[PDB]
Chain A
Amino acid sequence: TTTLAFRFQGGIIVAVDSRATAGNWVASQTVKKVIEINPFLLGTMAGGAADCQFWETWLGSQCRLHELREKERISVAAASKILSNLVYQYKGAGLSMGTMICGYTRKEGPTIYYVDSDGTRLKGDIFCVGSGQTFAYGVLDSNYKWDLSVEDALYLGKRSILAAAHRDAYSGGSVNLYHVTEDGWIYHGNHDVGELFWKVKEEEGSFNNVIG
């Protein structure tokens, strides 16, 4: 599993893989690792799938109730606080959850909060979580800039996921892309890892150690 999210002048880029494993056998390669909490907020998935799905859907319900009560769009800090307080109430029970909550508000701008099942809640710029986080983070560090255009940022996210999926056995399948702006999140598609590898090798000249 590899998930990543970063901020830039255009907003937020979120890129995930789609492989799930149960040991050596690949249970699925069509897993959706981005939770669509609401048309303005996104949440990544890592650790336990059921915990992430259930509690981020519950978080969407809570954000809706907040917007009904206060007649304003909730803050990303407040939603991440709600999720972190809830998971802290369960500390020691056995929940497994490491997620990135990504949003874009008028007052805060683009904002990413990493929330863990241990109660951790960190505001950040670049996050990479999973068994293949090292390669993807290396790519992002080598190529991150604040003034990246939307196309360059999407390509960078895809390239980082591809680099992680090539080396990590428990990572791969396909790449799901998302762009988060002020008006909401835009889905930029699913890209098969196998075809993407050959296309990238041809266009860049990389992976010379692999016979094509």
Chain B
Amino acid sequence: GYDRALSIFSPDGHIFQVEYALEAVKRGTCAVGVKGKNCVVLGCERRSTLKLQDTRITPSKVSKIDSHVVLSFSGLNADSRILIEKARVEAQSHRLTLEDPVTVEYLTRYVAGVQQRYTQSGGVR
């Protein structure tokens, strides 16, 4: 298979692919999250696309990973869909194995672990 080391170290100690992924995040639309006394608010910006866009069926950025946990993103949309699917599968698996829904920190740690694994594995970006 294809297992080339795409993410490697530069002479100054930087990993260029991670920095370029951060630039890709910079190109994405702007998302915001604020904490309240007893609530969390997520705001997202819609791109000023054509007026012929159908709002009913387009994906709406903010995705419920579980009935108590939501996720928003900024960057490439399809990669975000992949991460969202992995998070949903992991949430269901955890609820199955431990007879309790995931904590927010646990799901965040799982998603961050997936991202780190892609930063360190070969043949992927």
Contacts and interface: CB of A to CB of B under 8 A. Distances in A.
Are A and B direct contacts in the complex by CB distance below 8 Å?
A: yes
Interface of A: 70, 75, 77-78, 81-82, 85
Most buried by A among B98, B99, B100, B106: B98
Task: Identify whether the interface residues of B are mostly helix, strand, loop, or mixed.
Answer: helix
Nearest to A85: B97
Contacts, number: 14
Interface string B84-117: 0000000000000111100000100000000000
14 contacts: A70-B106, A75-B98, A75-B99, A75-B100, A77-B99, A78-B97, A78-B98, A78-B99, A78-B100, A81-B97, A81-B98, A81-B99, A82-B97, A85-B97
B88 to A, nearest CB: 21
Nearest to B98: A78
Contacts of B100: 75, 78
B104 to A, nearest CB: 13
A148 B104 CA distance: 41
B45 to A, nearest CB: 36
Closest 8 CB pairs of A and B: A78-B98, A77-B99, A81-B99, A81-B97, A78-B99, A81-B98, A85-B97, A75-B98
B123 to A, nearest CB: 29
A154 B12 CA distance: 69
Given A75-B99, A77-B99, A78-B98, 11 more contacts: A70-B106, A75-B98, A75-B100, A78-B97, A78-B99, A78-B100, A81-B97, A81-B98, A81-B99, A82-B97, A85-B97
A82 B97 CA distance: 7
B100 to A, nearest CB: 8
B113 to A, nearest CB: 12
A70 B97 CA distance: 15
B111 to A, nearest CB: 16
